[PDB]
């Protein structure tokens, strides 16, 4: 199976518990491409890093799952984890 | 078959576990129209969102099942989920 | 016999204990083509993955049984298992 | 989904922990329009910026949620964050 | 069903998590009218506001459930929530 | 809600760190009307201006909470703050 | 039930945070009457006023629970709260 | 049938979930009279208050079942529940 | 039978409740040799250590089941358990 | 008749449900003497303590049934149940 | 049954929340006699005092279970609890 | 990993607490390159040297993180610390 | 329990905030008898008088705990407090 | 088991609350040998001394776990703790 489920894990494990809550809150309002659904609010507010990675790779695909994570990380300020994620997924 | 069982599901899945319990508690004393029964305490205080949706569409109908849910949601303060539920069910 | 009963099993076996309930609930309201019946609520809410796959291939046929499963999976958000099922069934 | 949940977050994160308490205290007595509820004291006096933004966007809507926040910010003296919020939300 | 289970909820939700402990502790020693039982210590010291309201309306009735709660609230100093509860319940 | 929770805040925020201590100390011996309780020493000697305003408005009512604060302010010499508080609360 | 669980609470709530620690420390070496147990050090050094009152009335009885608290308060210097407790409990 | 199965329940319901574990642990090593067996560890460490009461009145008799419970409660420090149980059972 | 089912248990029983979840998540994406199947998500995300060991020795054999476990453990950083497993299995 | 089916029961009833699973799993690979068979997996992973005791005394004999149980109990760390089993069986 | 399970509990209940963690960590490397097993890390780092006492008396015997506890307690500095444990266990 | 996280630490540890506050105040208005975010006021005005270094290296990269710090240090007068930082980071 | 935990408290409560630091610093290098441990710097350099007394009586015994404190007090110059401690502890 | 887990503990308990944070920050940038992983920031910036010792001995081995700690301690200035650690570990 694709390695995109491991690049996201190494990015969501390098950020503290106060930035994970902000990530999960930003994930409720980020614009989405057509044909994709949105994770319900009842789950996004309890999931930890592992469940969040699994849900991200399940609802979206590998490529879009990586791109959306990188865009959200860039938007909230952190550009080191976003850069690492882009470097890992792109090649 | 009627799609009002899917609008209620999207309304009970966007609220946390401390708001679902309040919803189930206020469902015990909400005024009811004539000819409709009340869900007993034994089962109502254990069902999750899916079981709650099924049971709500079981005792009540599509139209009244949506209206009662919207009224209860507006009663407890949440006017976003109630608004989207009304928008979906009305048309 | 047809191999479409095996593609459905490989898709419903990757669903957790909470997503299978949502699948079985969405199966009660999904629009149906003319000439096909609906699974009764008495048995639908008790089956496991194997019984669900067998019953789905029983009421519907291979092609429609795969298409309905893929549509229900896409509707509830999961677009990875839906894509896998489509790839397996189409060719 | 609307972006007014993001403009409020950028306004409640630029004020210290001594002004957040004042904001949450003035939120308990601010005048409200008809049809809207008031956040209970039990939860309002324990939330941080993220939960406060989520609850403010949930109880009210995007437009009124932004207007009330701007009015409360202007009431307590801070005219820079209120102006930034108005500029972000209006256009 | 009577609306006395809603007036009590609005009174136990406007007091913090340190006053709820005091409420539950004082509930173990207040005088009781004849014919009524006392909540056991094992369950009382673990309930939050919702279960507390449910059990208070369960063991006692609506009228006595409101009067006892108002008396306990007045005993521990809080004369705002007690006054609001009295105003809601009496008329 | 009542606007008397804001007039008290504007009066306790104009007190230096040495005058707030004297206010909190003289609040321990001021005569009280019948039916009202006294704030315990455990919490009274730790609260800041915001918590003090909240507790003053909770233990007493709006009218008595304002009158007692004005009387205490006048008693220790400061008549500018007491005069402003009286002018704000009365009309 | 006995009122002695309310007289102790009004005595442990009138002492600051550095006197509760001293109270809990002197509670570890005060002489005890025969037949009564000693609170373990593991839980005694974490209890706040409410849990301390509950445990004090649980391990000992009303009369001995009041007398021991009065003796400990007198031994550590505070003669006002000890006098208040004695007056409340005796009559 | 004897009322000794009701006095034990009223004593095992006034103790919290952290004291029930200690009760069940001390029940594994308390000295026993001749002719009586010991509850196996496999079922003892999973029973709740109701099952524990039933097992205690089943393996032992009413008189010895009350005496053993009182002695175990007195051994572990709690002399209020033990005294209440003794008063209830003796006369 | 083979003793490699006991060396794996001694390695999966020394992982905390948070590292077993990571092990089960990384087991969903680890590269696999030809001719071997993959455990479905529906069952793998609920297994504890004992069922995980049994399933690992069921789908894979003794040698490959040990090598895959050692590789997964080493990949997530844990190089003490991997060393113990290698020492136990190789000789 | 032989009493070794009762000594085994007293050893399998003194261990919790989490250790019985480990016992049943370690029974799948323990070395066996020549001439004795192995319990199949289909039945072994469903039996409770009573069925396990009966089946263990069925395949093996009294002496070997006790010795194998003692060895397996020693392997998993429990040397108290193994000791009491040896004491009961040997004399 | 032996009373050495009661002397250990009175020693592990006198440790604060930070000394029990150190006890559990140092229990992972203490030298052991021949023939005795070591508690797995997965369960040892989550046990509280009661389960710790039960496991300590289960894996080892009464005498060794007390001696190991005394050795570990003295090794970390605390020679009061270890002293009373030795005094209780020896005679 | 890059060593620029250690060169910044030696620059923010040689300056007193009256200069760290000025550094943090100047960091709120310094011009920034395109695509980079600005640290919010709520967190920036509470960080010590270590948290400030971590946030500086996280929001920006190694090179820009060092260059911005050197520019800010040069702006506020200190040319020894900035020179040391430039010498360390450049080569 | 022994009264030597109270004689130490009456000696460490008469030290100003500048002499307690000197006492704690000299406690780090004082010669120790064989068989006794030394308090680590991580915890010792933050304790107040109450925690210091508790740790002093816990690590050492009553007699040695008093003697070491008296010697340290005499070594730093204070011979009135050391004399009082010796008089209290000796008889 | 090896005693190198206890030598690290004696070195991390001699660091104040401000030096442990610096140690944990230097642990994020220290060069690593080939074949060893790096602890994620999510858990590194929350751990206390005990969890840090356990995790350090978990990712690395006894020898490398000691050498890395000694080098990091020497880098940050403290050569007494590093000397003690080397003396303990080497022989």
Swiss-Prot record, chains A, B, C, D, E, F, G, H, I, J, K, L, M, N:
<comment type="subunit">
    <text>Self-associates; enforced oligomerization induces apoptosis, NF-kappa-B regulation and interleukin-1 beta secretion. Homooligomers can form disk-like particles of approximately 12 nm diameter and approximately 1 nm height. Next to isoform 1, also isoform 2 and isoform 3 may be involved in oligomerization leading to functional regulation. Component of several inflammasomes containing one pattern recognition receptor/sensor, such as NLRP1, NLRP2, NLRP3, NLRP6, NLRC4, AIM2, MEFV or NOD2, and probably NLRC4, NLRP12 or IFI16.</text>
</comment>
<comment type="function">
    <text>Functions as a key mediator in apoptosis and inflammation. Promotes caspase-mediated apoptosis involving predominantly caspase-8 and also caspase-9 in a probable cell type-specific manner. Involved in activation of the mitochondrial apoptotic pathway, promotes caspase-8-dependent proteolytic maturation of BID independently of FADD in certain cell types and also mediates mitochondrial translocation of BAX and activates BAX-dependent apoptosis coupled to activation of caspase-9, -2 and -3.</text>
</comment>
<feature type="cross-link" description="Glycyl lysine isopeptide (Lys-Gly) (interchain with G-Cter in ubiquitin)">
    <location>
        <position position="55"/>
    </location>
</feature>
<feature type="domain" description="Pyrin">
    <location>
        <begin position="1"/>
        <end position="91"/>
    </location>
</feature>
<protein>
    <recommendedName>
        <fullName>Apoptosis-associated speck-like protein containing a CARD</fullName>
    </recommendedName>
</protein>
């Amino acid at each position: 199976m694709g390695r995109a489920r491991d690049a996201i894990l190494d990015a969501l494990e390098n950020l503290t518990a106060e930035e994970l809550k902000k990530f999960k809150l930003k994930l409720l309002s980020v614009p989405l491409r057509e044909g994709y659904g949105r994770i319900p609010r009842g789950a996004l507010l309890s999931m930890d890093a592992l469940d969040l990675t699994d849900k991200l790779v399940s609802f979206y695909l590998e490529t879009y799952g990586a791109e959306l994570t990188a865009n959200v990380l860039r938007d909230m300020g952190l550009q080191e984890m976003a850069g690492q994620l882009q470097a890992a997924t792109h090649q």
